[PDB]
Amino acid sequence: ARYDDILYFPASRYPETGAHISDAIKAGHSDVCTIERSGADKRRQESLKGIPTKPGFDRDEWPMAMCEEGGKGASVRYVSSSDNRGAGSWVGNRLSGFADGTRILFIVQ
Secondary structure (H helix, E strand, C coil), X not given: CXXXXXXXXCCCCCHHHHHHHHHHHHXXXXXXXXXXXXXHHHHHHHHCCCCCCCCCEEEXXXXXXXXXXXXXXXXXXXXXXXXXXXXXXXXXXXXXXXXXXXXXXXXXX
């Protein structure tokens, strides 16, 4: 009852993103994303304040900006763009049908 559905994140396919999710969760950041898409732009901005872009890398956020849990205090790490683009799309496609408020537990595999 602390989540509605599970996603098994495929660390074998996206090991650099997957390593950050695991470290961030191991660090205490929530393993549940409660989906909240309206306030994502502002969370993104909050989490990355003071962090410059880096060539060939994306600034990866856990919890993610699309989650209630995201934003200020989110773990940020530069992850290689290929890895993080694929991870992003995998997650995005899997969550696209869940309504805001749906609580998703992430297990990194």
